[PDB]
Design an enzyme around this catalytic site. Structure first.
Site, mmCIF file in Angstrom:
data_model
loop_
_atom_site.group_PDB
_atom_site.id
_atom_site.type_symbol
_atom_site.label_atom_id
_atom_site.label_comp_id
_atom_site.label_asym_id
_atom_site.label_seq_id
_atom_site.Cartn_x
_atom_site.Cartn_y
_atom_site.Cartn_z
ATOM 1 N N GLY G 30 0.967 -1.569 0.075
ATOM 2 C CA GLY G 30 -0.155 -0.139 -0.060
ATOM 3 C C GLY G 30 0.629 1.325 -0.009
ATOM 4 N N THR G 31 0.241 2.174 -0.440
ATOM 5 C CA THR G 31 0.733 3.721 -0.126
ATOM 6 C C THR G 31 1.343 3.835 1.120
ATOM 7 O OG1 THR G 31 -1.063 4.679 -1.907
ATOM 8 C CG2 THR G 31 -0.775 5.849 0.265
ATOM 9 N N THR G 32 2.233 5.126 0.733
ATOM 10 C CA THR G 32 3.058 5.556 2.016
ATOM 11 C C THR G 32 2.115 6.980 3.045
ATOM 12 O OG1 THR G 32 5.192 7.202 2.534
ATOM 13 C CG2 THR G 32 4.178 6.336 0.414
ATOM 14 N N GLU G 47 0.982 9.942 0.207
ATOM 15 C CA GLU G 47 0.347 9.631 -1.262
ATOM 16 C C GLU G 47 -0.550 9.703 -1.195
ATOM 17 O OE1 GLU G 47 2.547 6.654 -4.257
ATOM 18 O OE2 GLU G 47 2.865 6.312 -1.853
ATOM 19 N N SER G 75 -1.676 3.582 6.308
ATOM 20 C CA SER G 75 -1.553 3.121 4.795
ATOM 21 C C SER G 75 -1.919 1.188 5.034
ATOM 22 C CB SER G 75 -0.155 2.493 4.355
ATOM 23 O OG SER G 75 0.757 4.451 4.883
#
Ligand SMILES: [Mg+2]
Ligand SMILES: [Mg+2]
Ligand SMILES: [Mg+2]
Ligand SMILES: [Mg+2]
Ligand SMILES: [Mg+2]
Ligand SMILES: [Mg+2]
Ligand SMILES: [Mg+2]
Lengths: 198, 204, 244, 250, 233, 222, 244, 196, 243, 4
Positions: G30-32, G47, G75
């Protein structure tokens, strides 16, 4: 209140019951049968608050007819009544107690002896030669205390009740439009269609 | 309206020399109306006696209750319940309903099979155990009964004598109580034997 | 999830049998043998003890015979612990009946109740059944002396003589053999013993290995007397019959 | 969330064996030994204090428990399961008896109540039987002195004596030889000590042993005087010193 | 592997996926198609209705949630009813209790949280339907995409169901064009259909096939069915 | 009813009458108003006879357990919290007015509990329909640092106050002493100042006086 | 055998809980997002993957607030984060109601902890598919925390999680080594836009949208507010500068 | 009952009498109506004894647990707990309580929760039946930022009056001092306070 | 059947693997710790290892204050530790509210143990992977040290240690006591006792320590507390004179 | 009841 009487002779039990349903100001019905056949040799009469009265008796009927089936047998009176007492004594501390008094009379095919039980709305039970509920007893007991005998023939009993009803008709404020009488014996239950005069 | 006063009734028990006695009257009425003159109020479970005055439906119920409870006890323990014990059973069984009691006034009498010392005890409607070594009373004629007993009683009375005493106490205290009487029964008790006599009394 | 660990105890085998009930009767067949025989004037219950030793205590023991009423008793074959649970509820229902009808309970009624609890565990609940088989012996006014039997499935049936636990077919045949309609108590006893003695998986039949009880309505009384045989009372009866 | 394990974990294997029960009995076998002996005027129970280290303090681990002033118990198996069993046992001793009859429960019954607790664990959904066997010893005015053993199956039996855990068979054998029906308490403590010696691996003394008896009434342990009906408890655990004084009479 | 990790929504795979949810999203992919898109003044819903035969009704795919918000369903119809009901309720509650018209952005926040509880609990089963929701509120026009996983995204336009990826590109291109269709309702609707047609294959769209809903400034969300859409082919 | 409690240099004592009554009638001429909670924690009670015994036993029990579970002798502040929260739970409907005292590893203690669940602590206290009479005496003769023997007389006197000047109390005097290092002593009938003078006559009725009708035996054993 | 990884609460034979670990994987995919503690507050940033040009700019907010002084970003599985925040909110309210004071950070944390940890205790639920960074300002200082699916949480001078986890923690340590004095929130906000931009390389294939927020005893009075307008563009640009 | 709490330079002082009555009889003449709910947060109890004791015990718990988990509790909080209990269970309670405590950041603070279940923070507060008689004196003699010695006086006087007039009050005066340096127990007998 | 290694049921050998596996989890952190009793105090020490330089050190602890008198140290993952903490505290308050006095350490242990035993017997709960050491100075028994583990075992120690290097330390200590003959250190101030402790850790673990590496806690009549970084230094310094 |  309505009239309910019972008398146990040598070979049977007789129950008498006023034939009227009054409400407030009018007499609604002159031919009420305040009784139910619990089992082919057991009869129960009742007197009490409007609905509770029937409602209660019909419930006991069901609950007994059911047993009779489940077991292909007929409970002795000493038993049927005890059951009834428990059901009443169970409700007195209920949210809305059944306000009913009942007279139960049956013939014990096994002991070959007749029996009559009186139980009030609180579950007070007691076995007796004769009994009544409410005010009725007040006029009748004296008569019975006087003219009753254990070895009485059935005929002798109907005359005694007649004598009773007569007194009640003579000295009781409310008109109960006569009674309906029934006899419980070995051969079962039969209704005496002749009591308007005998 | 006073549940304890509708049906009527009295019971009394007394201790003697290696014996106890308990008695009661036979009336059952509804207010002023006498109804049954065969309402024994003394019941027994094995060799332990209990009499109960008060509201008839409760008197009955309790009796049935104690049968049940005493029967299970015997199966579970394989011996008949003892007085000292039974009493505690009665007490606990009443307090269980402390806020909606059985309107009664049980009295217990019997003897320890093991120890032999006679025993009697009474209770108020919610459990308080009234332990006394001389006599116990209950019913509509309590005041009366107390009176009779406190006067006529004397320690170490023999079976043939204690009988009289208890009988008079009852008989006489009843006659001063409208709601009680119509007959009477008295149980005399001994280690091995027990006798039941009915009394002759006014029927008014 | 949890299904993973669920042994689905109330399912049906592709053959229409209930796995667990079936598997339970097996458990039972390994338990000491118990027997009941109905007479024209009494009923006898007898049983053999499982897992014993020289040091157990018989005097204060009761592992296969229990009193349910002053008029009803039962013999057990299976897990004792399970047996007790059912017995306690059984004892209770008797009194609930008495309180309700001021009359002692008809044997069949008690039995049907117990059986129905058992069947319960058979159709819903998701629990193991009771590894127990019962033979009940009692008296009443409608049918007199009666003997019944209930097993984990819940079925119950009536018998003039039956047995449960180890060596059923073995004993049952023996019974179908020496039993006769108009028997008498004292005689019943003999038979029960003979049978066990021919069905025992152990050496010889000694008193320490038994439990024995009878129900009689002695003509010199009125109340029906139940009598659990005290230890020495067992040894005594044993000599007479000729087991020594 | 919530206990969804509402089904049994003890079903029947096709051989008619209750898996978890036999398995539990095994766990018991692996547990330290413990035993008990009945005499005419008293009874005794004992075990070994398997100090899982020489750094722990033995006394704080009572393996012998008092359930009611006239009954005590001990085990062999998984200590924890015993502990919670004691609580439950001491509690039910009240809720189902003293709180209703004003007197403590007789042994058969209490034992019976315990058995009920264990059995339910042999059937109720979501649990595994207890991994312990217990011997309970006690007394009551009407039955006199008694000793019982309770297995995880729930079964319970009355023994003139017995032992359980590790060397059970061994010990049981030693007992079948030394026991009889005419023994005074002191004599039984003797036997118990010997029988225990045989199972005990290492150091054997009052600091590694735990005994308790059921006998004469103990007013000095009552705590108050006045009431004569209650003459004092019959259960006494022996102090470290009360043990050695007997060992030296081997 | 899979029959060891796709048994329930409470079991994570070793890569960290959630198979049941993932299987769920596929039902959407086999479901019919529908599209949403919004200008700065109106929002439209065009949905292609699927039939089982040439003898049935074309299962309704649009539901009015309140006078000001509504959606299109893709996949399991029951689940749509269930989830639109909740929205109808959470919409009612706002008006009643706060005399406030519920905010689309919150509508999403609710659907999301709703679906979620159904992807972390034993026995459950993710909702199996995708949804496009539109509404005109205090902060303007809106459009949301709801995926059973629990993901809800506010977009300018989009589409879901079989062959969706087609139209999704058309819009991706036509953005600059429609984000300026203010005041002209009819235009927006025509634009919706164009995009819908770039994900067709089977046949050409008809009067029994189509279904459309519209909301905005001076237009209460309304369901135009059959007869009325003729003027758009 | 008259119940008192007096603290002394290295312990505590309590006392009470023995009259139990249903209204104006004496129900038990020597009922016990002292209850054992634990070996060395005793409590005295007035109010509804049954509630005093019940809340006393119930807690006595819950206490007995608590100790076993902790391998420690019980503490008064415990019985006290246990009693009070129970009573307060029941809004005052459990007519138990109690004086609870005893010894435990932390020292000697004396407290009082009213049926509504409020507590007090002090060196001397009393409760009951005889409360006033005794409290008077107590306010008349107490002084700090009383011995064991001085305390008893005090407490004994106080009950006698109640007995004589309160219809609701009477008969004998029950006393219990609890000292820091010794076993506790329950002195039931410490004082018996109300014995009945021999009756003037004997009413041993000549046998036969009573009229009987029917007579039979009863069956006990099964 | 195996199977030690099909049910949540089960312990492998090496004391680990597999289901929890797999969870971590869902996070990593997953996204940070990160957080940085400063001299008098904390800053959070994350992000946003612009899956496509149809996402509406600045609209799909992902960071969240609790009460009025707590910010949260996580996240992984978005929804799970939402759920966790919800409980956080309910739990915070229950605190204020009974104690008046807005809940202290350490308190709040432990509160999020016990809830999560709780989801690694029964097999009827799965652990949370997100790691969360959250904090705020209280009676005695600023506080920054990070909580992993296992329900483990500690205090962080700075923290990062998601695909860019390692790049960030790298840049983070630099900061710690360089400014022991601490950092003024204004400076920190800028630095945050950096660490994200840099860390975006680990997923350089798609375009992104930035989102930040802060809580400063001197810049926001203690309440948690997002970054908008003037202040935001300032940092977006400070980023595109130091990249080459 | 006569109670009051006063805030001053060094911190705060609570004082009360020592009489609990059941009607017009004095049940306890030495009652301690100053109860601790924490090392440095106490309360004065007025109203039903039982209701108060119970409420207090429940707060000592709620705070003891607060502590373990989150350190030393503020007074505003000690009050909030009380308020919560009193306000939430109004139909079954008759207790008016005054909370006083000492913090290092906030010095001294007094909150009063009257029968209704409202909470009020103020320089000082009085309550108890005996307080009707001193709203005058107090509003008249009270100055902000007094010295310990000065405050003990003010309190000693105010209450002595209250005791003078209200029969529901008497016994001895008790005070408790809450400051950085600690906690002090002060007591004053009749023979002193009566003639002033 | 073959699932008997997933839930708390019996393995055919009479073992509850699930309990056993947890015992291994208690070591996942690689932290040792120990405790000892004084004349009128009780001390515990645990290693403080902070790998990531990004952690606010002041928040890394496996030492908790339960009650004004009870302190507990934990060997196990953190999430399972805090859980136990909360419950310890909760159980500690209830005990006081309901019973009047402060919860004894030995008692708190037993209760915690009983709670653990439960997880050993009910298939829905897993045990917690933590060994709990409770310490205080009971007003009755004196300085105390009781420990519990996932098996549900609890016992009191004259002193003890826990972690991977358990035995090293235990043996080391075992000797000291066989050497002196008594059940506790013989120093009056708690300050020397903390010293004795750190000493023996080194004398067995053969490693030297700095302030940011140790964590410590003490018990005294009516209070318990953890030492600040600095408070420890005063200790580390005072030892560089015996050795 | 009795007083008690
Ligand atoms: Mg009376
Ligand atoms: Mg009369
Ligand atoms: Mg008097
Ligand atoms: Mg890591
Ligand atoms: Mg005054
Ligand atoms: Mg478990
Ligand atoms: Mg599990």
């Amino acid at each position: 209140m309505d009239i309910i009487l019972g008398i146990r002779v040598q070979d049977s039990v007789i129950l008498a019951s006023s034939k009227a349903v009054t409400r407030g100001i009018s007499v609604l019905k002159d031919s009420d049968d305040k009784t139910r056949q619990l089992s082919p040799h057991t009869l129960m009469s009742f007197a009490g608050e409007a609905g509770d009265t029937v409602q209660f008796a019909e419930y006991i009927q069901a609950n007994i007819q059911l047993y009779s089936i489940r077991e292909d047998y007929e409970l002795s009176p000493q038993a049927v009544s005890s059951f009834v007492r428990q059901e009443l004594a169970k409700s007195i501390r209920s949210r809305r107690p059944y306000q009913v008094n009942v007279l139960i009379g049956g013939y014990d095919k096994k002991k070959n002896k007749p029996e009559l039980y009186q139980i009030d709305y609180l579950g007070t039970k007691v076995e007796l030669p004769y009994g009544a509920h409410g005010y009725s007893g007040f006029y009748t007991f004296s008569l019975l205390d006087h003219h009753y005998r254990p070895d009485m023939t059935t005929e002798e009993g109907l005359d005694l009740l007649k004598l009773c009803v007569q007194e009640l008709e003579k000295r009781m404020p409310m008109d109960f439009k006569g009674v309906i009488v029934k006899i419980v014996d070995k051969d079962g239950i039969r209704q005496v269609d002749d009591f308007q005069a005998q | 309206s006073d549940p304890s006063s509708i049906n009527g009734g009295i019971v009394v028990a007394m201790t003697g020399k290696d014996c106890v006695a308990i008695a009661c009257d036979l009336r059952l009425g509804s207010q002023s109306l006498g109804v049954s003159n065969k309402f024994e109020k003394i019941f027994h479970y094995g060799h332990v006696f209990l009499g109960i005055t008060g509201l008839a439906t409760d008197v009955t119920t309790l009796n049935e209750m104690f049968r049940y409870k005493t029967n299970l006890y015997k199966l579970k323990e394989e011996r008949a319940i003892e007085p000292e014990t039974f009493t505690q059973l009665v007490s606990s069984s009443l307090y269980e309903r402390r806020f909606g009691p059985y309107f009664v006034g049980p009295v217990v009498a019997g003897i320890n099979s093991k120890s032999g010392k006679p025993f009697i005890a009474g209770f108020d409607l919610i459990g308080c155990i009234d332990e006394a070594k001389d006599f116990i009373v209950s019913g509509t004629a309590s005041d009366q009964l107390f009176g009779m007993c406190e006067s006529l009683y004397e320690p170490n009375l023999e079976p043939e004598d204690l009988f009289e005493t208890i009988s008079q106490a009852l008989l006489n205290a009843a006659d001063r109580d409208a709601l009680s009487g119509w007959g009477a029964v008295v149980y005399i008790i001994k280690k091995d034997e027990v006798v039941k006599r009915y009394l002759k009394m006014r029927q008014d | 999830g949890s299904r993973r660990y669920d042994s689905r105890t109330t399912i049906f085998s592709p053959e229409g049998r209930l796995y667990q009930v079936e598997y339970a009767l097996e458990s039972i067949s390994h338990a000491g043998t118990a027997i009941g025989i109905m007479a024209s004037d009494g009923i006898v219950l007898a049983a053999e003890r499982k897992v014993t030793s020289t040091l157990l205590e018989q005097d204060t023991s009761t592992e296969k015979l229990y009193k349910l009423n002053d008029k009803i008793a039962v013999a057990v074959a299976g897990l004792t612990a399970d047996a007790e649970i059912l017995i306690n509820t059984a004892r209770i229902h008797a009194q609930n009946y008495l309180k309700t009808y001021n009359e002692d309970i008809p044997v069949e009624i008690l039995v049907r109740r117990l059986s129905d609890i058992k069947q319960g565990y058979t159709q819903h609940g998701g629990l193991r059944p009771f590894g127990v088989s019962f033979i009940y012996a009692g008296y009443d006014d409608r049918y007199g002396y009666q003997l019944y039997t209930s097993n984990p499935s819940g079925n119950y049936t009536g018998w003039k003589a039956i047995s449960v636990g180890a060596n059923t077919s073995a004993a049952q045949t023996l019974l179908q053999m020496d039993y006769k309609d108009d028997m008498k108590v004292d005689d019943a006893i003999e038979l029960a013993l003979k049978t066990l003695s021919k069905t025992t998986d152990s050496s010889a039949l000694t008193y320490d290995r038994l439990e024995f009880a009878t129900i009689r309505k002695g003509a010199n009384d009125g109340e029906v007397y139940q009598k659990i045989f005290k230890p020495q009372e067992i040894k005594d009866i044993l000599v007479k019959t000729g087991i020594t | 969330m919530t206990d969804r394990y509402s089904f049994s974990l003890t079903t029947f294997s096709p051989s008619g064996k209750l898996g978890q029960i036999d398995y539990a009995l095994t766990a018991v076998k692996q547990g330290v030994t413990s035993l008990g002996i009945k005499a005419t005027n008293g009874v005794v129970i004992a075990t070994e204090k398997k100090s899982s280290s020489p750094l722990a303090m033995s006394e704080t681990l009572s393996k012998v428990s008092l359930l009611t002033p006239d009954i005590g118990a001990v085990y062999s198996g998984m200590g924890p399961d015993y502990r919670v069993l004691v609580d439950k046992s001491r509690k039910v001793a009240h809720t189902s008896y003293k709180r209703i009859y004003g007197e403590y429960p007789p042994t058969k019954l209490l034992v019976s109540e315990v058995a009920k607790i264990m059995q339910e664990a042999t059937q109720s959904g979501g649990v595994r039987p207890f991994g312990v066997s217990l011997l309970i010893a006690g007394h009551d005015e009407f039955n006199g002195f008694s000793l019982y053993q309770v297995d995880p199956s729930g079964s319970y039996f009355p023994w003139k004596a017995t032992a359980i855990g590790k060397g059970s068979v061994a010990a049981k054998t030693f007992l079948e030889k030394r026991w009889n029906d005419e023994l005074e308490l002191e004599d039984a403590i003797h036997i118990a000590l010997l029988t225990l010696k045989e199972s005990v691996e290492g150091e054997f003394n009052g600091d590694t042993i735990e005994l308790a008896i059921i006998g004469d009434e103990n007013p000095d342990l009552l705590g108050y005087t006045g009431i004569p009906t209650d003459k004092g408890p019959r259960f006494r655990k022996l102090t470290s010193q009360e043990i050695n004084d007997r060992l030296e009479a081997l | 592997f899979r029959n060891n990790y796709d048994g329930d929504t409470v079991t994570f795979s070793p890569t960290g996926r959630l198979f049941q949810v993932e299987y769920a999203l596929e039902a959407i992919k086999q479901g019919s198609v529908t599209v949403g898109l919004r200008s700065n003044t109106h929002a439209v819903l065009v949905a292609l209705k699927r039939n089982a035969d040439e003898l049935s009704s074309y299962q309704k795919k649009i539901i009015k949630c309140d006078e000001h918000m509504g959606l299109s369903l893709a996949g399991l119809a029951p689940d749509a009813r269930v989830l639109s009901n909740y929205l109808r309720q959470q919409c009612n509650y706002s008006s009643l209790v706060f005399n406030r018209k519920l905010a689309v952005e919150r509508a999403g926040h609710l659907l999301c949280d709703k679906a979620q509880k159904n992807t972390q609990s034993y026995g459950g089963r993710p909702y199996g339907v995708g949804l496009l929701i539109i509404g005109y509120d205090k902060s303007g026009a809106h459009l949301l995409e709801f995926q059973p996983s629990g993901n809800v995204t506010e977009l300018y336009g989009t589409a879901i169901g079989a062959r969706s990826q087609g139209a999704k590109t058309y819009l991706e291109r036509t953005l600059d064009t429609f984000i300026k269709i203010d005041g002209n309702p009819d235009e927006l609707i025509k634009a919706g259909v164009e995009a819908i047609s770039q994900s067709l294959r089977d046949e050409s769209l008809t009067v029994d096939n189509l279904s459309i809903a519209i909301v905005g400034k001076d237009t209460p969300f309304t369901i135009y069915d059959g007869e009325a859409v003729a003027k758009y082919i | 009813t008259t119940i008192v409690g007096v603290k002394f240099n290295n312990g505590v004592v309590i006392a009470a009458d023995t009259r139990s009554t249903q209204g104006p009638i004496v129900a038990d001429k020597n009922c016990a108003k002292l209850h054992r909670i634990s070996p060395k924690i005793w409590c005295a009670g007035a109010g509804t006879a049954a509630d005093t015994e019940a809340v006393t036993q119930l807690i006595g029990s819950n206490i007995e357990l608590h100790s076993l579970y902790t391998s420690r002798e019980p503490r008064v502040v415990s019985a006290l919290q246990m009693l009070k929260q129970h009573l307060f739970k029941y809004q005052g409907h459990i007519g138990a007015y109690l004086i609870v005292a005893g010894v435990d590893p932390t020292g000697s203690h004396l407290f009082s509990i009213h049926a509504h669940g409020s507590t007090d602590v002090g060196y001397y206290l009393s409760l009951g329909s005889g409360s006033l009479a005794a409290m008077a005496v107590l306010e008349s003769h107490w002084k700090q640092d009383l011995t064991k023997e001085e305390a008893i007389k005090l407490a004994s006197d106080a009950i006698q106050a109640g007995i004589w000047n309160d219809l609701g109390s009477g008969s004998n005097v029950d006393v219990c002493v609890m000292e820091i290092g010794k076993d506790a002593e329950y002195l039931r009938n410490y004082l018996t100042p109300n014995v009945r003078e021999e009756k003037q006559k004997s009413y041993k009725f000549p046998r036969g006086t009573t009229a009987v009708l029917k007579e039979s035996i009863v069956n006990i054993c099964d | 055998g195996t199977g030690y990884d099909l049910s949540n609460s089960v312990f492998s034979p090496d004391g680990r809980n597999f289901q929890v670990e797999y969870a971590v994987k869902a996070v990593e995919n997953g996204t940070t997002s990160i957080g940085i503690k400063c001299n008098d507050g904390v800053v959070f940033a994350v992000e946003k993957l612009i899956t496509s040009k149809l996402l509406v700019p600045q609209k799909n907010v992902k960071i969240q607030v609790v009460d009025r002084h707590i910010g949260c970003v996580y996240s992984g599985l978005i929804p799970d984060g939402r759920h966790l925040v919800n409980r956080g909110r309910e739990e915070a309210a229950s605190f204020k109601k009974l104690y008046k004071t807005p809940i202290p950070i350490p308190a709040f944390a432990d509160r999020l902890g016990q809830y999560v940890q709780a989801h690694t205790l029964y097999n009827s639920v799965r652990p949370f598919g997100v790691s969360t960074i959250f904090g705020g300002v209280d009676k005695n200082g600023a506080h920054l925390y990070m909580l992993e699916p296992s329900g483990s949480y500690w205090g962080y001078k700075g923290a990062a999680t998601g695909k860019g986890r390692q790049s960030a923690k790298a840049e983070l340590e630099k900061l710690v080594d360089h400014h022991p004095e601490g950092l003024s929130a204004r400076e920190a906000v800028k630095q945050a836009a950096k660490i994200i931009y840099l860390a975006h390389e680990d997923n350089k294939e798609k375009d992104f949208e930035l989102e930040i927020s802060w809580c400063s005893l001197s810049e926001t009075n203690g309440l948690h507010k997002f970054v908008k307008g003037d202040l935001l563009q300032e940092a977006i640009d400070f980023a595109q500068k130091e990249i080459n | 009952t006569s109670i009051m709490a006063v805030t001053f330079k060094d911190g705060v002082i609570l004082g009360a009498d020592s009489r609990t009555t059941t009607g017009a009889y004095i049940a306890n003449r030495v009652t301690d109506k100053l109860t601790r709910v924490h090392d440095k947060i106490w309360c004065c109890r007025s109203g039903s004894a039982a209701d108060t004791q119970a409420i207090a015990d429940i707060v000592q718990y709620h705070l003891e647990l607060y502590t373990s988990q989150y350190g030393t509790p503020s007074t505003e909080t000690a009050a909030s707990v009380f308020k919560e209990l009193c306000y939430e269970n109004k139909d079954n309670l008759t207790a008016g309580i005054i909370v006083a405590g000492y913090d290092d950041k906030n010095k001294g603070e007094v909150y009063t929760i009257p029968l209704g279940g409202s909470v009020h923070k103020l320089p000082y507060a009085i309550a108890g039946s005996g307080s009707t008689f001193i709203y005058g004196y107090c509003d008249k003699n009270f100055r902000e930022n007094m010295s310990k010695e000065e405050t003990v006086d003010f309190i000693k006087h105010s209450l002595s009056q209250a005791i003078k007039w209200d029969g529901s009050s008497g016994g001895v005066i008790r005070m408790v001092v809450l400051t950085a340096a600690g906690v002090e127990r002060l007591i004053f007998y009749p023979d002193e306070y009566e003639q002033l | 059947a073959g699932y008997d290694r997933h839930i708390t049921i019996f393995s055919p050998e009479g073992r509850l693997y699930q309990v056993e596996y947890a015992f291994k989890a208690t070591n996942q952190t690689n932290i040792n710790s120990l405790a000892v009793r004084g004349k009128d105090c009780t001390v515990v020490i645990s290693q403080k290892k902070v790998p990531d330089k990004l952690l606010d050190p002041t928040t890394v602890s496996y030492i908790f204050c339960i009650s004004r008198t009870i302190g507990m140290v934990v060997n196990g993952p953190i999430p399972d530790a805090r859980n136990a903490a909360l419950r310890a505290k909760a159980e500690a308050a209830e005990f006081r509210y309901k019973y009047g006095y402060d919860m004894p350490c030995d008692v708190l242990a037993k209760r915690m143990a009983n709670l653990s035993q439960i997880y050993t017997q009910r298939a829905y709960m897993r045990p917690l992977g933590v060994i709990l050491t409770f310490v205080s100075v009971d007003e009755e028994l004196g300085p105390s040290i009781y420990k519990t583990d996932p098996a549900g075992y609890y016992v009191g120690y004259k002193a003890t240690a826990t972690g991977p290097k358990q035995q090293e330390i235990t043996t080391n200590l075992e000797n000291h006591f066989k050497k002196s003959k008594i059940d506790h250190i013989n120093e009056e101030s708690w300050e020397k006792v903390v010293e004795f402790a750190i000493t023996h850790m080194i004398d067995a673990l053969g490693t030297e320590f700095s302030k940011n590496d140790l964590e410590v806690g003490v018990a005294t009549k009516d209070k318990f507390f953890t030492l600040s970084a600095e408070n420890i230094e005063e200790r580390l310094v005072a030892i560089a004179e015996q050795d | 009841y009795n007083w008690x």
